[PDB]
Write a protein that binds this ligand. Sequence first.
Ligand SMILES: OC[C@H]1O[C@@H](O[C@H]2[C@H](O)[C@@H](O)[C@H](O[C@H]3[C@H](O)[C@@H](O)[C@H](O[C@H]4[C@H](O)[C@@H](O)[C@H](O)O[C@@H]4CO)O[C@@H]3CO)O[C@@H]2CO)[C@H](O)[C@@H](O)[C@@H]1O
Ligand SMILES: *[C@@H]1O[C@H](CO)[C@@H](O)[C@H](O)[C@H]1NC(C)=O
Ligand SMILES: [Cl-]
Ligand SMILES: [Cu+2]
Length: 235
Amino acid sequence: HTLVWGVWVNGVDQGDGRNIYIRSPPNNNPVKNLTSPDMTCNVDNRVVPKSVPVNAGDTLTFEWYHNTRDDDIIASSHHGPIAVYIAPAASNGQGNVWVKLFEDAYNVTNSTWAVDRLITAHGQHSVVVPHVAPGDYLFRAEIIALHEADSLYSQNPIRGAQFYISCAQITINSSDDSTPLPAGVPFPGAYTDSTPGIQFNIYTTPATSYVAPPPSVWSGALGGSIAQVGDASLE
Ligand SMILES: OC[C@H]1O[C@@H](O[C@H]2[C@H](O)[C@@H](O)[C@H](O[C@H]3[C@H](O)[C@@H](O)[C@H](O[C@H]4[C@H](O)[C@@H](O)[C@H](O)O[C@@H]4CO)O[C@@H]3CO)O[C@@H]2CO)[C@H](O)[C@@H](O)[C@@H]1O
Ligand SMILES: *[C@@H]1O[C@H](CO)[C@@H](O)[C@H](O)[C@H]1NC(C)=O
Ligand SMILES: [Cl-]
Ligand SMILES: [Cu+2]
């Protein structure tokens, strides 16, 4: 159970974005129905009034929270991977438009899931803004919590993989457009009961054997990280 508070650009807090530049849901309940329109940008998908200004090569940091900003972020039980997708705001999330910029499941070294490191990062994880066409974009941050993903929602509607999905409105101003954005996958649509990483038992199976859902990270992606970039408590 977790939501996005707002974003930092190159370590600069852009302020509360909820229902302003984040298409926020009315609460932190997970999305579980893989076929639902709710898979696109969560249960409250509509153009909100603002879009954050960035340029190619900027560091965009999502900040998540549980009850209050900079609290415990997400329950320690919600072990899982973290992904970030981009689509043209054009699409409004519809069609084969979602392009993956970032994937992080399990770090063998530290033996932490992405979600574990997000809690440590005070809810902060980042992507470097790719060199796509200047214009208006949605950045879709997705946390998959697997604490009940041993079942499928379609077979047992009180269990299943849990999706914490937040779409940010981002306007890319300066970019040489050296990596034009290809077509991508639909949400709903890319995840089905058979897709790897959707049904998995973190209780019986080792986290090294975990394989996050497709698609693969676009070669145009400039990577990212899970780690605090700024102090919310100084505001
Ligand atoms: O831990 C292994 C065990 O986990 C079982 O699943 C547990 C989760 O572990 C636990 O974290 C989860 O707690 C939920 C709780 O159900 C929610 O109702 C509550 O929702 C609150 C919310 O947190 C508030 O922020 C908001 O204001 O109000 C809502 C509405 O009440 O959020 C917490 C997590 O933050 O509960 C699960 C029980 O199903 C697995 O079932 C089991 O298989 C595992 O072995
Ligand atoms: C999942 O969402 C689809 C499309 O909105 C809907 O028809 C279906 O009834 C939902 N499944 C459940 C269990 O509600
Ligand atoms: Cl839960
Ligand atoms: Cu939860």
